[PDB]
Amino acid sequence: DISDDFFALFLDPTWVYTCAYFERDDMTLEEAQLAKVDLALDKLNLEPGMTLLDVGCGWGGALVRAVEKYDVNVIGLTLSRNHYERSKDRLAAIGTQRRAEARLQGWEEFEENVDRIVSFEAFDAFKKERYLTFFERSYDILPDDGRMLLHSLFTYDRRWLHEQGIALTMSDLRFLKFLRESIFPGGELPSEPDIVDNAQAAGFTIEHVQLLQQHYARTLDAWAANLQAARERAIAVQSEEVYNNFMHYLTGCAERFRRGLINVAQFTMTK
Ligand SMILES: Nc1ncnc2c1ncn2[C@@H]1O[C@H](C[C@@H](N)CC[C@H](N)C(=O)O)[C@@H](O)[C@H]1O
């Protein structure tokens, strides 16, 4: 229900809407988003001509980067029409002899063999009842030496937080309720075991876990700063209610990454 024109006011030109990676401290938002995509794609050991699946591809930035820098064939899946349309157009506009396609299709319906899989903050949009099924499907469509890079948010429970010196406040519970009752992610995040245990049961080895908690804090701060700087135009595209809701989500989430209440990581998964 939120127009691309609203998101365009605060995202960088890649349209990437997930945790960036400030590999160098002076990177711009765009450089840090490309660095996050490259950080993940480098872990897949892509050779030109391989086929990469991006599960939950958003507006196509990682797919475009994969084609341009890694010279791979690409398939992107999304359930959002707006994500599909922009991904479709952007991929068609790349000059490449490779196959590059976006699809309005869920991973549940995708059964084609691919060489490698990437996914950036789609897994939290899956129902917990599909966590194992997702890893089983991913394992099935990969070759014997296949690799998956799962970039996913995840949460911590009260006990673990407490052991780390962190408490959930009444305000945090209200913020979680706000997330669930909104168009924003973070309401029903998986735990780390939800990711690791189900991946391992499907047959994957967790070769590496790279946490990006403080990179997300910085990313969210940048989105919030951009949106506030374009407040009038954002209100015109949507409304003051929506603008304030987004600022609440962006700054509230940034605060909570800094505090350590949740995390985001890249899981390198091998067969
Ligand atoms: N079962 C599903 N299968 C495929 N895509 C899904 C599924 N559920 C949600 N999605 C898509 O996952 C994406 C979630 C986004 N947060 C991912 C953003 C994108 N990967 C980025 O880095 O900017 C959206 O494009 C959803 O439409």
CA gyration radius, whole angstroms: 18 Å
Question: What class, by secondary structure content?
Answer: alpha/beta
Number of domains: 1
Can you identify the CATH superfamily? Answer: Vaccinia Virus protein VP39
Keywords: Lipid biosynthesis, Lipid metabolism, Methyltransferase, S-adenosyl-L-methionine, Transferase
Protein name: Mycolic acid methyltransferase MmaA1
Pathway: Lipid metabolism; mycolic acid biosynthesis
GO molecular function: methyltransferase activity
Briefly, what is this?
With 271 residues, this protein is α/β, with parallel strands linked by helices. Helices cover 46% and strands 17% of the residues.
If you had to describe this structure to a student in words, what would you say it looks like?
It is an enzyme of class 2 (transferase). S-adenosyl-L-methionine binds at residues 17-18, 56-58, 78-83, 107-108. The chain has helices at residues 4-7, 29-42, 61-70, 81-93, 131-141, 158-163, 170-180, 192-202, 213-229, 231-237, 240-259, and strands at 51-55, 73-78, 100-104, 116-120, 147-155, 205-211, 262-270. With 271 residues, it is an alpha/beta fold. The protein has a single domain, classed as Vaccinia Virus protein VP39 (Rossmann fold, 3-Layer(aba) Sandwich), CATH 3.40.50.150. It has a 7-stranded mixed sheet. Helix 5 (131-141) crosses helix 8 (192-202). It binds sinefungin. Sinefungin (SFG) binds next to strand 2.
